[PDB]
Amino acid sequence: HHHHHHMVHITLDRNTANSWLIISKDRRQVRMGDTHQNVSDNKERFSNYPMVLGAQRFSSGKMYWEVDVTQKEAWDLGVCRDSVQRKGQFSLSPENGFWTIWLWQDSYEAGTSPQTTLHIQVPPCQIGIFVDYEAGVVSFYNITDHGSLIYTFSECVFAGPLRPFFNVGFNYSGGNAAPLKLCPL
Numbered sequence: 055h056h057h058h059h060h061m062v063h064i065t066l067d068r069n070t071a072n073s074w075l076i077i078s079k080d081r082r083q084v085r086m087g088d089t090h091q092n093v094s095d096n097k098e099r100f101s102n103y104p105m106v107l108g109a110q111r112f113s114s115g116k117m118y119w120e121v122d123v124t125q126k127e128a129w130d131l132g133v134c135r136d137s138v139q140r141k142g143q144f145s146l147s148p149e150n151g152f153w154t155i156w157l158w159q160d161s162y163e164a165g166t167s168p169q170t171t172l173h174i175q176v177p178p179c180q181i182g183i184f185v186d187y188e189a190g191v192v193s194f195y196n197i198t199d200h201g202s203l204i205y206t207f208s209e210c211v212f213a214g215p216l217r218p219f220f221n222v223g224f225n226y227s228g229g230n231a232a233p234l235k236l237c238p239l
């Protein structure tokens with residue numbers, strides 16, 4: 055891919071974060087805390103899962119950003135509708151307004167319903183996410199493997215403004231404390 059030149063500066067939106075998350079001062083890193091982070095509840099916060107949105111909203115154009123996933127056992131990445139459900143239980147699917155991939159239990163899968171197996175030869179330490187709003191495309195690239203394609207969602211029904219989406223995952227094992235980090239352009 056040659057998508058890096060639609061690079062956008064993504065920052066995290068504190069107000070949308072699950073109350074156990076810790077967002078860095080520069081709003082470029084997020085990790086799971088070992089407790090509630092002493093914030094008030096609000097209607098934006100994801101209640102059930104360790105999720106947070108980017109501050110940026112997109113309704114047109116081409117956008118590209120990169121995320122560091124080094125040393126993590128579990129995470130979800132992609133984009134979602136601004137109008138996604140925040141409270142209670144839900145699945146990550148295009149029907150629910152999410153275009154995502156994840157790592158879980160040593161397998162990589164795309165967030166279709168049902169989920170789709172990914173074939174990645176080089177486990178990624180950094181993921182590139184490309185959105186073409188007009189084309190209806192969300193694509194994922196393996197930065198560790200020369201930018202190789204991971205997965206493409208096409209004919210997407212965005213149905214409104216889009217936000218960058220992140221899930222740092224639980225840390226029941228003690229092996230998933232590492233942060234997600236937005237990488238420099």
Ligand SMILES: Cc1cc(Cn2nc(C)ccc2=O)on1
Nearest residue numbers: 072073074101102103104105224
């Ligand atoms: C049972 C249980 C409790 C937690 C800790 N916790 N985590 C989040 C992300 C949201 C609510 C919350 O209670 O994780 N599993």
